Design an enzyme around this catalytic site. Structure first.
Site, mmCIF file in Angstrom:
data_model
loop_
_atom_site.group_PDB
_atom_site.id
_atom_site.type_symbol
_atom_site.label_atom_id
_atom_site.label_comp_id
_atom_site.label_asym_id
_atom_site.label_seq_id
_atom_site.Cartn_x
_atom_site.Cartn_y
_atom_site.Cartn_z
ATOM 1 N N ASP A 1 39.542 34.956 46.509
ATOM 2 C CA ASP A 1 38.951 36.259 45.975
ATOM 3 C C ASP A 1 40.110 37.222 46.907
ATOM 4 O O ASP A 1 40.434 36.842 47.949
ATOM 5 C CB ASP A 1 37.765 36.429 46.450
ATOM 6 C CG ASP A 1 37.164 37.733 45.982
ATOM 7 O OD1 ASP A 1 37.903 38.633 45.448
ATOM 8 O OD2 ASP A 1 35.816 37.930 46.313
ATOM 9 N N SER B 1 34.733 37.416 40.402
ATOM 10 C CA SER B 1 33.406 37.878 41.023
ATOM 11 C C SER B 1 33.115 39.330 40.487
ATOM 12 O O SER B 1 31.935 39.459 39.973
ATOM 13 C CB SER B 1 33.571 37.767 42.589
ATOM 14 O OG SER B 1 32.024 38.241 43.041
ATOM 15 N N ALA B 2 33.940 40.222 40.510
ATOM 16 C CA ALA B 2 33.670 41.601 40.235
ATOM 17 C C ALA B 2 34.176 41.772 38.635
ATOM 18 O O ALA B 2 33.866 43.163 38.130
ATOM 19 C CB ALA B 2 34.526 42.621 41.187
ATOM 20 N N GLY B 3 34.943 40.850 38.129
ATOM 21 C CA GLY B 3 35.649 41.079 36.845
ATOM 22 C C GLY B 3 36.737 42.167 36.960
ATOM 23 O O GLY B 3 36.948 42.691 35.736
ATOM 24 N N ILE B 4 37.634 42.322 37.960
ATOM 25 C CA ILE B 4 38.420 43.266 38.104
ATOM 26 C C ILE B 4 39.812 42.854 38.742
ATOM 27 O O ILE B 4 40.872 42.882 38.066
ATOM 28 C CB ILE B 4 38.173 44.520 38.663
ATOM 29 C CG1 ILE B 4 37.645 44.351 39.965
ATOM 30 C CG2 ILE B 4 37.223 45.190 37.751
ATOM 31 C CD1 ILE B 4 37.121 45.826 40.695
ATOM 32 N N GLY B 5 39.845 42.341 40.033
ATOM 33 C CA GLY B 5 40.827 41.807 40.574
ATOM 34 C C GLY B 5 41.503 40.780 40.020
ATOM 35 O O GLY B 5 42.717 40.928 39.376
ATOM 36 N N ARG B 6 41.146 39.521 39.895
ATOM 37 C CA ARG B 6 41.777 38.282 39.457
ATOM 38 C C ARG B 6 41.613 38.646 37.861
ATOM 39 O O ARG B 6 42.541 38.121 37.225
ATOM 40 C CB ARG B 6 40.918 37.123 39.798
ATOM 41 C CG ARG B 6 41.132 36.998 41.431
ATOM 42 C CD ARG B 6 40.430 35.683 42.086
ATOM 43 N NE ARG B 6 38.804 36.232 42.487
ATOM 44 C CZ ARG B 6 37.834 35.602 42.982
ATOM 45 N NH1 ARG B 6 38.354 34.398 43.304
ATOM 46 N NH2 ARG B 6 36.746 35.911 43.155
ATOM 47 N N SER B 7 40.806 38.884 37.260
ATOM 48 C CA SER B 7 40.468 39.123 35.865
ATOM 49 C C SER B 7 41.697 40.079 35.320
ATOM 50 O O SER B 7 42.406 39.681 34.328
ATOM 51 C CB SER B 7 39.295 39.766 35.642
ATOM 52 O OG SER B 7 38.062 38.918 35.719
ATOM 53 N N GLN C 1 43.371 44.157 42.043
ATOM 54 C CA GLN C 1 42.777 44.813 43.283
ATOM 55 C C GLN C 1 43.691 44.996 44.477
ATOM 56 O O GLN C 1 43.346 45.552 45.482
ATOM 57 C CB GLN C 1 41.426 43.812 43.676
ATOM 58 C CG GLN C 1 40.432 44.318 42.879
ATOM 59 C CD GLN C 1 39.641 45.648 43.196
ATOM 60 O OE1 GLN C 1 39.083 45.634 44.092
ATOM 61 N NE2 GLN C 1 39.841 46.741 42.348
HETATM 62 O O1 LIG Z 1 36.489 38.799 42.212
HETATM 63 C C1 LIG Z 1 37.607 39.408 42.344
HETATM 64 O O2 LIG Z 1 38.772 38.934 42.032
HETATM 65 C C2 LIG Z 1 37.669 41.216 42.720
HETATM 66 O O3 LIG Z 1 38.054 41.839 41.942
HETATM 67 N N1 LIG Z 1 36.427 41.099 43.560
HETATM 68 C C3 LIG Z 1 35.793 42.507 44.131
HETATM 69 C C4 LIG Z 1 36.245 43.339 43.782
HETATM 70 C C5 LIG Z 1 35.690 44.654 44.197
HETATM 71 N N2 LIG Z 1 35.876 45.998 44.166
HETATM 72 C C6 LIG Z 1 34.955 46.719 44.797
HETATM 73 C C7 LIG Z 1 34.062 45.768 45.605
HETATM 74 C C8 LIG Z 1 34.376 44.493 45.152
HETATM 75 C C9 LIG Z 1 34.065 43.178 45.537
HETATM 76 C C10 LIG Z 1 34.869 42.222 45.016
HETATM 77 C C11 LIG Z 1 34.263 40.999 45.347
HETATM 78 O O4 LIG Z 1 34.697 39.827 44.954
HETATM 79 O O5 LIG Z 1 33.749 40.824 46.542
#
Ligand SMILES: O=C(O)C(=O)Nc1cc2[nH]ccc2cc1C(=O)O
Length: 297
Positions: A180, A215-221, A261
């Site tokens: 993450d 987990s959030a549907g944004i960083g890795r996604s 992210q």
């Molecule tokens: O799962 C990821 O790749 C990701 O984007 N994770 C996250 C993105 C987030 N943005 C704001 C809070 C937050 C928590 C997580 C988290 O996972 O704690």
């Protein structure tokens, strides 16, 4: 080239600034339904919500809300649903959406436990004889089989509408070594995995959109889909120089906030698209190189 830009940004050590420039430029649309009091327990993170305009609505009359967004990449002609890791009370909703959206594949880029905390519900069966029933959504889910590789696993899941006893096959592609707020171990193992997903026909337009989650549907996604769409765009035009990665990421951010992210996931994106370009521009042989580098057995 993206590759001259890469070299420039690396030399001036300016990934953080480039990345902030994107965050600053990113779309800001309302997420009023996400923030209704009733949907509090349907959102994993307070600061990650779907925009109203792009959210997926469940086809139910009780409460149609899920923390999921449709990313519709117009020029590339590919759509993805991005969503958070299902909560213990939204796993029925998750599978409801998979069913209703007619998705063939689910790409999961997180583990259930990461950084000593739980990032996602156990929303699929881990053995064949112990199926899951989601009574709220009237769905059965069964592990049909699984193929465990060193750093990812593919499963065939059967989903049954208990209402009609109609059945569908879902493919689950579970990347297990992507930390993450981190990056994949190499461009080769990322691309090997992406290419597995594509090979399966789970991205193909005769299916609903693939469901992508971390987990959030944004960083890795976001990183996964950015690499995918950029390669697709280069593939339809056969013109790598014509693809502006930062611009494609801002376009994706019109449909869900916060995609990619960290500045290093952006850096990683570049590397993945630059490497992937070899294959897209007709060196078929790099695929099997990727597969050997990635050590999947
Ligand atoms: O799962 C990821 O790749 C990701 O984007 N994770 C996250 C993105 C987030 N943005 C704001 C809070 C937050 C928590 C997580 C988290 O996972 O704690």
């Amino acid at each position: 080239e993206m590759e001259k830009e890469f070299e420039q940004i690396d030399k001036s050590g300016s990934w953080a600034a480039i990345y902030q420039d994107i965050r600053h430029e990113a779309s800001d649309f309302p997420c009023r339904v996400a923030k209704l009091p009733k949907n509090k327990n349907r959102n994993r993170y307070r600061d990650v919500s779907p925009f109203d305009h792009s959210r997926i609505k469940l086809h139910q009359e009780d409460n149609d809300y899920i923390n999921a967004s449709l990313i519709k990449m117009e020029e590339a002609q590919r759509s993805y649903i991005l969503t958070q890791g299902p909560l213990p009370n939204t796993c029925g909703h998750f599978w409801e959406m998979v069913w209703e959206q007619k998705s063939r594949g689910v790409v999961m880029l997180n583990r259930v436990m990461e950084k000593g905390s739980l990032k996602c519900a156990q929303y699929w069966p881990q053995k064949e004889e112990k199926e899951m029933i989601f009574e709220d959504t009237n769905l059965k889910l069964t592990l049909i089989s699984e193929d465990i590789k060193t750093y990812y696993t593919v499963r065939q899941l059967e989903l049954e509408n208990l209402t009609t006893q109609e059945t569908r096959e879902i493919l689950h592609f579970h990347y297990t070594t992507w930390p993450d707020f981190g990056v994949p171990e190499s461009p080769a193992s990322f691309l090997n995995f992406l290419f597995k997903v594509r090979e399966s026909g789970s991205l193909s337009p005769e299916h609903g959109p693939v469901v992508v989650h971390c987990s959030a549907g944004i960083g890795r996604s976001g990183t996964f889909c950015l690499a995918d769409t950029c390669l697709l765009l280069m593939d339809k035009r056969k013109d790598p120089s014509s693809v502006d990665i930062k611009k494609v990421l801002l376009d994706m951010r019109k449909f869900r906030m916060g995609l990619i992210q960290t500045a290093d996931q952006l850096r990683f994106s570049y590397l993945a698209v630059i490497e992937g370009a070899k294959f897209i521009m007709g060196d078929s042989s790099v695929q099997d190189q990727w597969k050997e580098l990635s050590h999947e057995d």
